[PDB]
Design a protein around this ligand. Structure first.
Ligand SMILES: Nc1ncnc2c1ncn2[C@@H]1O[C@H](COP(=O)(O)OP(=O)(O)O)[C@@H](O)[C@H]1O
Ligand SMILES: [Mg+2]
Lengths: 50, 443
C-alpha cells in the first residue's frame, strides 16, 4: 500500500517534470516584444471565380 | 558586342585530327606550314606542361601573321587566357617597362577555384514579415514550393531584410544562396490580382521549377594571376583592378603569391590554366624589354609568348646596331621562328570571297576576278577595303549585286599607295617637303 502511494507520487512528479520542460521550451520559442503594436506585410495566392 | 572586323572571318586554325592543315577551313586559306606550326603550338599550350617557350611569326606584310594569332586564339576558345598587346602599350608613365611586361605576362595565367554551393529554388506561396513600429525586432516566415514538395522557413533578420529589399511577392519564382545570401528573381508564376498600377507587365510567365527544393551546384571562379597580385599588393588594389594605377607591385608579393598558388595546386584547391601572350609589332620594344623577356621566360609560372615581326634586318630600338629581325640575338636564340609566305592568285581570290561572305556582299564572278587582279597588282588589303565601298556604290545604283562598273568606280574614287606616290611625285610643289617648303599659290 505504501509503495503504491509512493509510485503514484513518483508518476505525478515525472509527468510534472516533463510537462514543465516542454513549457519552458515553448516559452523560449515565444521570445518577442511584449504587448507592442506590430506591422505585418502578407502576400498569398488568392483563388478567383467569375 | 562586335562588328565585322578585319579578322572576324576566321573561327580557328582549321586542322584535322592529325594536325594536317585543310586547304580551306574555319576561315583560313593556305599557309599550310604556318598553320601546322601554329597547331603544334596550340597542342603545346593545351598540354599545359611546357613553360616559357617563345615563338616568332615572321614574314612580309599581309601574309596573315595576325590572322594566324587570331586563329590560335579562336582554337583556344574561352577558359584559356589570351593577352593581345602591342609593343607601344608597354611604354607607360605610371609603371616601368619591366613592370608593364610583368603584368602582361601574369595576365596570361589563369587560376580556377571550384566551389560547391547550395541553392534554394521554388515558387513562393506565402510571404509574411511582421515588424514592430518603433522597434527593431522582426519576425517572418515564407512558404516556398516546388512541383513535388512544399515547406515553410522561419527567417532570420538578414534574410528578412534581403527579401524586403528584393521586393519578393507571392507570384515570384526566386533562388536563394544559403552562403552568399543573394536573391535572384527568375520570373513570375501568375498575375498580380489586377491592381491599377502595373496592369499587364507580368504576362511573360515562367514554369514552376521541378525537383528537390534545395539542390547543390558547383561554381567556378576564374581569375588571372595578375588580378591576384593586384588584390594582394595593397588594400586599395581591388579598385586598381578597374581604375588602373596598380603601381609597381613589390617583388615579395609576387613571390608569396607564386608560393601560395603552388600550394593550392598541390592541394587540389585550384587549377592553373596557362595561356598565350601575343605581342603585335615587337620591334617597337626597347632592348631592356627584350632582356627582361629573356630572363622572365625561365620562370615556372610563365606563359607561352608569340611575337609578330616583318622588319627583316633593322635597328633594335635602344641600340645603334642592326639585328636580324629587329631583335637581339639573345632573344632569337631561345625562340622558334615560324615563317609566312606571299599568297598566290587563287589564295587571294578565295580570301576575297571569304571576306565578301563575311561582309554580306554578293560579288559577281567578273567583279571577283577584277578584284583579284587588283589585289595581286596593288594589295590584298586594298581590295578587301574596296569590297564594302563597291557594295555601297551598288546600293547607290539600287542594285543588289556588285558588278565590274561598281568596282571600277570604287577604284577611281579611292587610291592605292602607288598611285598616291605617283601623284605626289608629279605634283611635289603642292605638298610640304621634308625641308619645310611648299608653294601655296597656283600662279
Ligand atoms: N591565310 C589566311 N587565311 C585567311 N585570311 C587571311 C590569311 N592571311 C591573311 N588573311 C586576311 O588578310 C588580312 C591580313 O591581315 P594581317 O594578318 O594583319 O596581315 P599581317 O600578316 O601583315 O599582319 C587579314 O584581314 C586576314 O583576314
Ligand atoms: Mg598584323
Amino acid at each position: 500500500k505504501l509503495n503504491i502511494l509512493s509510485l503514484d507520487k513518483f508518476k505525478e512528479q515525472e509527468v510534472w517534470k516533463k510537462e514543465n520542460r516542454l513549457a519552458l521550451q515553448k516559452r523560449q520559442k515565444q521570445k518577442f516584444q511584449p504587448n507592442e503594436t506590430i506591422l505585418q506585410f502578407l502576400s498569398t495566392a488568392w483563388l478567383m471565380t467569375p | 558586342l562586335s562588328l565585322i572586323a578585319a579578322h572576324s572571318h576566321i573561327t580557328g586554325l582549321g586542322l584535322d585530327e592529325n594536325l594536317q592543315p585543310r586547304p580551306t577551313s574555319e576561315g583560313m586559306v593556305g599557309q599550310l606550314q604556318a598553320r601546322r606550326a601554329a597547331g603544334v603550338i596550340l597542342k603545346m599550350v593545351q598540354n599545359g606542361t611546357i613553360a616559357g617557350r617563345a615563338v616568332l611569326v615572321a614574314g612580309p606584310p599581309s601574309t596573315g601573321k595576325t590572322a594566324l594569332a587570331m586563329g590560335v586564339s579562336q582554337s583556344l576558345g574561352k577558359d584559356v587566357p589570351f593577352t593581345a598587346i602591342a609593343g607601344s602599350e608597354i611604354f607607360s608613365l605610371e609603371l616601368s617597362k619591366t613592370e608593364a611586361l610583368t603584368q602582361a605576362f601574369r595576365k596570361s595565367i589563369g587560376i580556377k577555384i571550384k566551389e560547391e554551393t547550395e541553392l534554394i529554388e521554388g515558387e513562393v506561396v506565402e510571404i509574411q514579415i511582421d515588424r514592430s513600429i518603433t522597434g527593431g525586432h522582426k519576425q517572418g516566415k515564407l512558404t516556398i514550393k516546388t512541383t513535388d514538395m512544399e515547406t515553410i522557413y522561419e527567417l532570420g533578420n538578414k534574410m528578412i531584410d534581403g527579401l524586403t529589399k528584393e521586393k519578393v511577392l507571392a507570384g515570384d519564382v526566386i533562388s536563394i544562396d544559403k552562403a552568399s545570401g543573394k536573391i535572384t528573381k527568375l520570373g513570375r508564376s501568375f498575375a498580380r490580382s489586377r491592381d491599377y498600377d502595373a496592369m499587364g507587365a507580368d504576362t511573360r510567365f515562367v514554369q514552376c521549377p521541378e525537383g528537390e527544393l534545395q539542390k547543390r551546384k558547383t561554381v567556378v571562379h576564374t581569375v588571372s594571376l595578375h588580378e591576384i597580385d593586384v588584390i594582394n599588393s595593397r588594400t586599395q588594389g581591388f579598385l586598381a583592378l578597374f581604375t588602373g594605377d596598380t603601381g609597381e607591385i613589390r617583388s615579395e608579393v609576387r613571390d608569396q603569391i607564386n608560393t601560395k598558388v603552388a600550394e593550392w595546386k598541390e592541394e587540389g584547391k585550384a587549377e592553373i590554366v596557362p595561356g598565350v601572350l601575343f605581342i603585335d609589332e615587337v620591334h617597337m620594344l626597347d632592348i631592356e624589354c627584350f632582356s627582361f623577356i629573356n630572363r622572365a621566360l625561365e620562370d615556372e609560372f610563365a606563359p607561352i609568348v608569340m611575337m609578330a615581326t616583318n622588319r627583316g634586318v633593322s635597328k633594335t630600338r635602344g641600340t645603334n646596331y642592326k639585328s636580324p629581325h629587329g631583335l637581339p640575338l639573345d632573344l632569337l636564340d631561345r625562340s622558334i621562328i615560324i615563317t609566312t609566305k606571299s599568297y598566290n592568285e587563287q589564295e587571294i581570290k578565295t580570301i576575297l570571297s571569304i571576306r565578301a561572305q563575311e561582309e554580306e556582299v554578293e560579288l559577281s564572278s567578273d567583279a571577283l576576278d577584277l578584284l583579284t587582279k587588283t589585289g595581286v597588282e596593288t594589295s590584298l588589303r586594298y581590295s578587301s577595303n574596296l569590297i564594302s565601298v563597291a557594295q555601297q556604290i551598288a546600293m547607290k545604283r539600287k542594285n543588289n549585286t556588285v558588278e565590274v562598273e561598281d568596282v571600277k568606280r570604287a577604284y577611281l574614287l579611292f587610291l592605292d599607295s602607288a598611285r598616291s606616290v605617283k601623284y605626289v611625285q608629279e605634283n611635289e610643289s603642292q605638298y610640304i617637303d621634308d625641308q619645310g617648303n611648299v608653294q601655296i599659290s597656283i600662279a
